[PDB]
């Protein structure tokens, strides 16, 4: 691997050991594609990158040799589509193995890459054309996807919007993506002097919700991968030689810090599947056939998992598991202990950050902390005047960034100073996260700062739903909270005054719940309506 | 000139028939370098294009040969830095001739021109930066403007920001504009397939007030030159082979409403007077001695002009636009010259949208009437049309397309766009009134911008400038009527534990908003007070 080329030392005897000894070790020019894929396919061509299935039988071995080749012929399909330096191009992928082709391209030519959820729809897309100013679109051909993003693209006009799609029929404006990919060069030049990128250069976005109004750009810079060493080193702890598997999607956040970066680093190889059902005992028979040796999921998933005979699947290789996203109940800790032998160790960060607060490997897990501040990350708890909370406070996770900002902390919220500077200032990144910190030093999550909605893993600014409803006839006015669930974390609440019109009952619930997932990804429909004469103001 | 070329007919017996009848013919492929200088270029190219003169004695004659050949050296400039389709490049260059080389070298790459004041400071210079992702700057040596980039620069970091400056010596990290410029080729080919220009690709983008928060993007498409075509031949009358000068910098929009689109499409040059301090008898003695023909300017410099006793026999029609209008500026300038001030109105996002066209008798005061192709409607709270009388927001119809002219969106901001964009109507938040004849009467913003002398200002520039100084514990920023002003910019603030009220306070609290953003915002009338 070529981890210790990147850090002051790979190994540490305690928590105490790892603050005070750890450092990453920023090389003057980082780019993750050309400084590790393609070092790895120069000098273990054949180390293993990527093991890629299907609920198909299908089945992709990837070297980093192979990734080398494809990330190449990737840049050039990009170059020949007027894609070059800066230029921000959406990718709407799952977890096709062509994500991982098209994100290593855009990185070699200096272009944006902005992975989004095939969930999203017409008015979403449309919100990202045009805060982004997307120059292409790669998105699978599945799902009505295109048709979304056609949708989309009528809205904003007759544009020169570049489409590209992943499979599917000829369509008319639409490039076929593979069918171009192979017809592309395997030599890419290297872009050089100005062209080239550099360390503050921006190589990656996600829309990320606000506690107002719509998605923010969170923006990352070129040495953001490194920050994942301490995600996929320290706090899933994978070994070069294993087999990392994290499930999540490749439009969210946590795809790159389990499927990506600091994974391959550590000389670790990823495990992708790339199904369009859940279904636990399919997860767990071709993880356990693939020889996965590091494994992290949500809460949820691990809630299906142990609902299954684990010892069926005797999950041999398995030999660390790590859980972030959402309420770690103990019983789930338990249960999973139970049945493999391993600890299931809490992890947490955001998208603007890696993983900052993780119960790392030298320490005993207290199911439900999120655990202790990582090395580089400045962590305080700060209170409403700005002052600092001492143990057994809540007070909002903030980030100290006085001197200097901490590799994997983003840039700024792209096109967004104000926003910025509202949320970055006086020397501290605010997360609108709120925690408290018990006696022994471990962190307690217990919410947000502001209206920000987590349902099960998913980040919900109560704007995105409140714009969908105000649409319906049915809605005057509308309020959308989170309310305490116990498995969810919180769930959506909408509180709505009808109009004139209609009657509050059960079957207008449901078609309200109908219309927002038609409006926008499904994920934001209000679990619970309730109708009312008035809202507070 | 190529105006027939664009418009179904030219010749109009009324208002009535030029509202009814006037439409503009946009192009499959429209860009305004390739399709209007160059192609004057090409087949008449001793036909003169713009005269430009200092108060230092220097002139220089353009022809639009020489604009083809400089807009090409342009071209061929931003390329060798970088600069292609889709890149933003604010440009800060007062009235230097470098404007409109720049101008049109960035049109033929598809570039994105940026215009700006030169007296924006380091704080709205990083805002501009951060919100365009502007690749370069090009600015004048002087007015301490590349002072004011290099602190910027230096706030945002190391990014790969280009800084190009016209005159001055030689400084570290900057690009001499004018003699880069004369070292570039002059062969430019036109960018073709996947990096050619379309309709509905920006080219032109104004940072512009918001009622609320920092100044927005106006995005405007290829097609927005052509509907300067109503600013320059039926609004301000100009002629092909006249001499058009409108009194407008280079980092405002009015500057391309009288300087540049719709008076080269009408084939009618323009005069560009770059001066430092205003002095009216060196103006009057400038237009005279070119022989201006049609001439536009502001009320303020209207009231400057007719303060001096007015032979100025090539001018032929005269427009007013920016602020109110007094009925004795009116007169008096009618007095002085046998001219009417025909008033003309719009916004950042549009051209020419209502005005006192040539048909029609002014009323002095009044706005006039609505532009062809503009649907211009007054619109209540309830979003019900207004009748004669009634003050309602000016609103422009858009259920059967864009006007040519009209803006495309405010850029990275579609929320915004959305909300002043939406149910088949643009809110512009100028409100106004309509008589019985049907002229249009402007009565203030719907909103919190303040305008004072003709700066449109968003009351949080202001807002955010004073909470920076330590007396400051709260503020709200409004405005006042002002005879002279139209408004006049006051700050009402709560002071902090550790201040007084004093003049001297409120003076110190006028230089630190002059030091912190563009100074023709700060506030007139302070007020302190306990809440
Ligand atoms: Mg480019
Ligand atoms: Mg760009």
Redesign the interface.
Known sequence: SLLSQFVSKTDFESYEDFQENFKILVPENFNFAYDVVDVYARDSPEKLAMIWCDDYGNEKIFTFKDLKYYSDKAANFFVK??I?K??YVMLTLKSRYDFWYCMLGLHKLGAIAVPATHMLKTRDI??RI????L?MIVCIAEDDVPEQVDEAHAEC????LKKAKVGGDVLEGWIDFRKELEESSPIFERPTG??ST?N??ICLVYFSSGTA??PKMVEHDNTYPLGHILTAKYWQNVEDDGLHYTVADSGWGKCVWGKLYGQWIAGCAVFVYDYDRFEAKNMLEKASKYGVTTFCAPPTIYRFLIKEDLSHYNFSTLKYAVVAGEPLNPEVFNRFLEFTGIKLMEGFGQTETVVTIATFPWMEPKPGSIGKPTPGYKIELMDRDGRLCEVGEEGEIVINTMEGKPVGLFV?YG?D??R?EETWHDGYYHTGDMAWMDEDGYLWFVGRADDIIKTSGYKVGPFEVESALIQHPAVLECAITGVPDPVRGQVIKATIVLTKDYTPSDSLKNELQDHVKNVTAPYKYPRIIEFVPELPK
């Open positions: 589509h007027g070059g800066g230029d449309v919100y045009e805060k982004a100013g120059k006009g007759d544009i020169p100005e062209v550099k503050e250069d109004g719509f700024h096109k100073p104000e910025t």
